Curated annotation (Swiss-Prot), chain A:
Residues with the (3R)-3-hydroxyarginine modification: 81
Protein source organism: Escherichia coli (strain K12)
Gene from which this protein is expressed: rplP
Molecular functions per Gene Ontology: rRNA binding; structural constituent of ribosome; tRNA binding
Alphabetic keyword roster: Hydroxylation, Methylation, Ribonucleoprotein, Ribosomal protein, RNA-binding, rRNA-binding, tRNA-binding
Protein name as catalogued: Large ribosomal subunit protein uL16
Curated annotation (Swiss-Prot), chain G:
Family: Belongs to the bacterial ribosomal protein bL27 family.
GO-annotated biological processes: assembly of large subunit precursor of preribosome; cytoplasmic translation; cytosolic ribosome assembly; positive regulation of ribosome biogenesis; regulation of cell growth; ribosomal large subunit assembly
Keyword Cell inner membrane found: no
Lineage of the species this protein comes from: Bacteria, Pseudomonadati, Pseudomonadota, Gammaproteobacteria, Enterobacterales
Keyword annotations from UniProtKB, A to Z: Ribonucleoprotein, Ribosomal protein, RNA-binding, rRNA-binding, tRNA-binding
Record's keyword annotation contains 4Fe-4S: no
Name of this chain's protein: Large ribosomal subunit protein bL27
Highest taxon in the source lineage: Bacteria
SUPFAM superfamilies cross-referenced by the UniProt entry: Ribosomal L27 protein-like
Amino acid sequence: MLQPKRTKFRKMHKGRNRGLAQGTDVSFGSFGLKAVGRGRLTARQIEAARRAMTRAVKRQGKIWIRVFPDKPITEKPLAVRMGKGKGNVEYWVALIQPGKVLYEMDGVPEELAREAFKLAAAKLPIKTTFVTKTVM
Amino acid sequence: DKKSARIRRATRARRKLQELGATRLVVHRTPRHIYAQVIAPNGSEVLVAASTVEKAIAEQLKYTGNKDAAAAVGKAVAERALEKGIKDVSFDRSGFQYHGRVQALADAAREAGLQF
Amino acid sequence: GIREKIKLVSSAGTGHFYTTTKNKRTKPEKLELKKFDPVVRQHVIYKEAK
Amino acid sequence: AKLHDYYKDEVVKKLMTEFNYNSVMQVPRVEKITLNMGVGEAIADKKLLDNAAADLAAISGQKPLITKARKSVAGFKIRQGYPIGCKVTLRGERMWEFFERLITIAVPRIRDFRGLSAKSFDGRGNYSMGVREQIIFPEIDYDKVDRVRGLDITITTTAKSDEEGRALLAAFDFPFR
Amino acid sequence: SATIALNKRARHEYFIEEEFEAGLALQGWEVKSLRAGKANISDSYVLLRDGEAFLFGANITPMAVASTHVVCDPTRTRKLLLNQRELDSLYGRVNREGYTVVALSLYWKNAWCKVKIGVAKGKKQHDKRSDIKEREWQVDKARIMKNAHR
Amino acid sequence: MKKDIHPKYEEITASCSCGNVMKIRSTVGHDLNLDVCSKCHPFFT
Amino acid sequence: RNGRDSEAKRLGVKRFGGESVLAGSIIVRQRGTKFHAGANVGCGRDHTLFAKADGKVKFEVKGPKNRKFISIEAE
RNA sequence: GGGGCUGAUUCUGGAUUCGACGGGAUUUGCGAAACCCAAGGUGCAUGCCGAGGGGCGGUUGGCCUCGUAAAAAGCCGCAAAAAAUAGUCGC
RNA sequence: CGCGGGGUGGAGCAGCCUGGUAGCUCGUCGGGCUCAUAACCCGAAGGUCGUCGGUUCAAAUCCGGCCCCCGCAACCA
RNA sequence: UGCCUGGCGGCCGUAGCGCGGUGGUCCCACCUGACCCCAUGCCGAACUCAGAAGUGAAACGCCGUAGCGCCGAUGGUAGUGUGGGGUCUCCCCAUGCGAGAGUAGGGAACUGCCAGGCAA
RNA sequence: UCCUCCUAAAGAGUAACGGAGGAGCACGAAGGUUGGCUAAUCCUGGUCGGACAUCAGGAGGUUAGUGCAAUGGCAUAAGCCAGCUUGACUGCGAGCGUGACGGCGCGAGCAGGUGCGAAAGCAGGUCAUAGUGAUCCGGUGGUUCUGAAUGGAAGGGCCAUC
RNA sequence: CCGACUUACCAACCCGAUGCAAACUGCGAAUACCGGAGAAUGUUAUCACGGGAGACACACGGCGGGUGCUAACGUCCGUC
């Protein structure tokens, strides 16, 4: 599970998921999975996508996860009225903009990795596409 | 460093002289020389400058850079100052402690007739 | 609070005084500061009071 | 000024023929020895430093000097601004004869002498020496004293390299073991 | 004072000769429960091997529970801080088949657990009848003595 | 350099009792005769 | 355990560049020393730069460290 | 489920378990492990091959040993390892 | 806020006043005491009298203060 | 005027560092000496005075050096003013402003006054 | 109730039972002036002393410090040390910012008068921003200002203040 | 035990590369806001003073946000 250590602030504002991705393309590995849809990736979604992606190779290669939640989202308890402060911490999502490389893999053939990211894409909420290593 | 460590002490003195728009009276000390200049409030044009590095003034003195040389040029630069009608100055310490040679230089300008 | 107000009356015969604070516990000694008296139009010593 | 005249004639012409000094200021010169006795345990009692200063009292012109704490340390039960040690900064003319009272006559007064270290350097070319006790000085008569307080002495010369300063030490009878 | 539960019944069963004021090392949950928190002392003895004099019979349970993760048992062989003078002499006069070191009382010495320990000798029951007789013998003797003055 | 707070001075003349004389300015006290000189200091044998 | 906040002190700039004001008019309210004294500008007890004389306010950056200066040209 | 209270006698700063125990350091006696220098002794030995290892098997990735091959030492499971390993009371 | 007194051995109480030449006992240690301790018996110790000044031949005393323990009616910002 | 140095500035990283050569004639620094002027939580280090024998070591200055810092396009892009539109939690179009960052590169300063030195 | 940051959308300002925190003091010096000096944290080496003392050497750069929360600041130091002092003085004060108002703040300069420094200069408090309640009531000192037929006095007004 | 070799890996410094921040900023707009200059046009639109008011329960839409589930013909601000 992905989780920050000693965060500067326990609660933070909602914010607006606006703009495009500040992560460019494949840098570490050889093959990547770049997100196309705009949304938020929870920490439980990434690990569940990680297990299905790593299932195809079963140990092989290394999977460079280029994203991290680092954003706690509060949820009020059930059957309480509005107001009375802010809810506590429940889960941690990642602000994902379109054009963001999610996972990078290397040391495996591209044919095997194609289903590996696609099976990860089923567990992932957002629509994504397989990308290769960038040129120049 | 003893040079630039002294300079930052003199920076406080030089701020007051230029902010108030007052003509300063600067000095400079050498193991064998002494220097004293009159500097306009413009900060880049110097009006009166007489020192013991001058060959026409050091030849009347035995040693350049002692109390007798500072008092010789303190009176000399003051006479040129009153020839321009200059009467409003403030003695810049220039980082040096106001006890001895720099002090005895300024009293010679006080002796010649310039108050500051 | 532990620093209490006092009355700083002058050494002259004028009834004019000053009102400031001192710590009796920290400083058992009294204050003697040559302030300005407006009645005398000069400087005299000032002694504490209650 | 006893060995300084020995330094000015013998050692100076030795050093410029040693490292090929083409300048008369290029030869390193001994300038200061820093005599510090960090007794330390005078946190509660003043007499563990005042008598330490009184045991220190026999070097330079006049009254003794103590130090202050650098900062607050819980481990040795000290706080900020504490008289802890006593130090001496001896540079100039009066520190020359102290060498003969330290390197010529105190060395035979060393209990169980074997040899001085040659690898105790500040990096720039300055040696730091250490004595276990104080009896090696001729000043103490070992009658009215009550302590065996040693005192670190660091000699700081105008050396560029460590062996260049060591060449100055070799010219001033350093027992390199 | 700061006394804790004491083995007064040990005086009926044992006739301890020499005492000690050795200290006892104890865990963090023990100190809170020691002032109050139901510490018991019955059947307290020792289990020395080399220098491992342990207060054996000491039932002290945590009143307010301060136990997490790893285990915490109310009855333990707590290590005694014994002097080396008091240590080598217990290779001798405690190994005599009946000789033991018991703790008469438990207390504090300025927020430190110091336990009054003593070298018990142990009474057989044939001389237990004599001591109870003797205690009644001392009382009834002066009763006869006071009847001269009535 | 400053004034009056550097450990005190007392001029003597000394000499070792082994045929070696070390007569310098010192700060010991009244006077003292030394016992061991550097020439007899055993760092050679 | 929140909602406790102070009241705003109305800091900032009162007169901009090119504006002519009389003596004693407050130029800039500030806490630190972001704006420094140039000409005819004095610094108050609480870093209140006040107009020493008449003229227009000039914002200038001078010095080795390029500190901001407020100066008054008596025009 | 929420709120309050209490959480080692100091309850607001100066913990010093009087102790073997775990730890560091100092002094002290000096040791191929707390070391190197072929020099004093000192001419025929060392290393790798071959080579077996106490009672059994193995054993230091290396040993007390072997002038070209079957005997000799530390150690591992084996085996001489002991028992009311405080008291006190019983059939 | 200004009315009533007392502060003295480690402790609690007197001498003071009706002037000058400070004690008592509780807690202590010293001994006796004792199959054992103790009951109980005595031996010894301690503050110049809360503090600072004045009067007085003479201040612990008396008077001036100041400080402390309080007690008191006040107590309508 | 030229070559220098020193004193005072403008602007203040293209103006700052690292590294390599440079200078003592004048100047400057180191220095020499110090009862006395005077300095001091210490010993003429610094501070202070009296001299200048020696040195350019060090400092400082100049030159080289982009080995770094720094400045920096054109364009593109983000963002946004206003006006409309959509699958109106986000975008598109029209028009207006236009980055940051990076890239091409630029650059190891420049400028004003006064005094002595040497060449004129 | 007040102060600091964000929320707050680059003037100021702007709410919620929105998100983080502080204050109900402290200093007679921690004030003013004059003069001086410049941290953190490391490794180099040295008697106790070792990771943590005392001393010297360099890196390093104010991540230090600023009585105290954050923010904005500060080496020209607003940081630190020493010298001498009370300007933590009085009567004013052009002109401003701030609020519905009551109210709060800045302020050169004038006069009296003081301290520091030779001097220009600085000081009518603390690096700044919280450290605090209006009026009435009554207490205290000063002031004839008034004082009831007059003379005082009582009682008030005013100024200082609780 | 010796301990030689080996090791997924847990691991600070230093550097390179990659992302996130309302309470991070060495960068930095658009507009907004203030002041000055100018012509056009506006039955003064400006300010001050005096008399009389009502009003201090807003709502939705657009935009910038807090909050709520970027759920509410939801709530709380700014803006038209």
